[PDB]
Amino acid sequence: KVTQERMEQIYEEVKTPYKYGLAVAPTDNYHKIDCPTVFRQGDKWLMTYVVYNGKTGTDGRGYETWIAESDNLLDWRTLGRVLSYRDGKWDCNQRGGFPALPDMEWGGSYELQTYKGRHWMTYIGGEGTGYEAVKAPLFVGLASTKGDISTAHEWESLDKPILSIHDKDAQWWEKLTQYKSTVYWDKDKTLGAPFVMFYNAGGRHPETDLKGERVGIALSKDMKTWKRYPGNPVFAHEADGTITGDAHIQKMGDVYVMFYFSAFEPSRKYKAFNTFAASYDLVNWTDWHGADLIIPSKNYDELFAHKSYVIKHDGVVYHFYCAVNNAEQRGIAIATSKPMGRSAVRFPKPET
């Protein structure tokens, strides 16, 4: 276990008390923006994000993935789509992507790594319409590109998923559906494979029958064929309906830090929030015991302040997250370790 002292040091290193405000917001109530992944190439910071094109759980088609650029991590300009609705294919209605192989060094280059001359991305994919297919199963897809990842171009994707609830070796914790994945290139092969996927998924505990979303691992030698980690799930909070998800891992030397979100956790009065855990081995996680990193506190994030991507650059920590208010307007906001100004970006007026 990571010592309480080391955990407190990590907290001080990663905390972001000061909310800049919205970074990427919908301009009407029939789009919802979520799932930031921030990286950089050359002179631009980049953020992929998902857009759901409905107001309610059932009206929209599903996810597409977009990309935005920034010179300063705070002010973002949307460039266009990188994963679009794909008629005729398995993932025609849901294409919600998460770039893969990030450089994991806390305060490092924040680049995406190339493997076999390509950049890579996994995604939530499937055919069901509505918000995340209205609880129907979605599957983990794989996309890649030889293109310039700093531009809005369509990445290439496989015509079947790479992981599914229907796989022979699917485990109890992922039988209902799969959600976010991220693949890391662990050249040290800590878990015996170079490609390590952390993903969250829904299932019911086989003994206690508690439903929830939990975090587990899949392993690959080549990005194409995957095996589940036998010790899954590796990170969970066991209470009925509690969500633990969107694992985002960075390395502070020997310590891995998992930034994650939870929702409907009985020990927090607020409905969704971000916090962290830490590990020396990627399998046994020590949960932070102090204040959560991001919680609802402004009008724009008063319902959920959740899902993480964290950049340390030039002495400042930037924590990107999904802000949802009571009107269920949904966009991406930023918190920082010191005040960096205030965003003028706002949600549109909510509906009655």
List keywords for this structure.
352 residues, mainly beta, 4-stranded antiparallel beta sheet, 1 helix, 3% helix, globular, Beta-galactosidase, hydrolase, arabinofuranosidase, plant pectin, rgii
Notes on the structure:
The chain has one helix and 20 strands. The protein is mainly beta and 352 residues long. It has one domain (1-352). Strands 1-20-19-18 form a four-stranded antiparallel β-sheet, with no helix packed on it. A four-stranded antiparallel β-sheet has the order 2-3-4-5, with no helix packed on it. The longest helix has 11 residues, at 4-14.
Helix and strand arrangement:
Layout: H1 4-14, E1 18-24, E2 32-41, E3 44-52, E4 63-70, E5 77-83, E6 94-99, E7 119-126, E8 139-145, E9 156-157, E10 177-185, E11 195-204, E12 211-220, E13 227-228, E14 243-252, E15 255-263, E16 272-279, E17 286-287, E18 304-313, E19 316-324, E20 330-336
Keywords: Calcium, Glycosidase, Hydrolase, Metal-binding, Signal
GO molecular function: hydrolase activity, hydrolyzing O-glycosyl compounds; metal ion binding
Protein name: Beta-galactosidase
**Biggest sheet details:** 4 strands, antiparallel
**Rough outline:** globular
Determine the number of helices (DSSP H or I, runs of at least 4 residues). Answer: 1
Total count of strands: 20
Fraction in helix: under 10%
Cα-atom radius of gyration: 19 Å
Along the chain, the helix and strand elements come as HEEEEEEEEEEEEEEEEEEEE
Strand order of the largest sheet: 1-20-19-18
Derived from helix and strand composition plus strand pairing, the structural class reads mainly beta
Number of domains: 1
PDB class: hydrolase
Keywords: glycoside hydrolase, arabinofuranosidase, plant pectin, rgii, hydrolase
Assembly: monomeric
Entry title: Glycoside hydrolase BT_0996
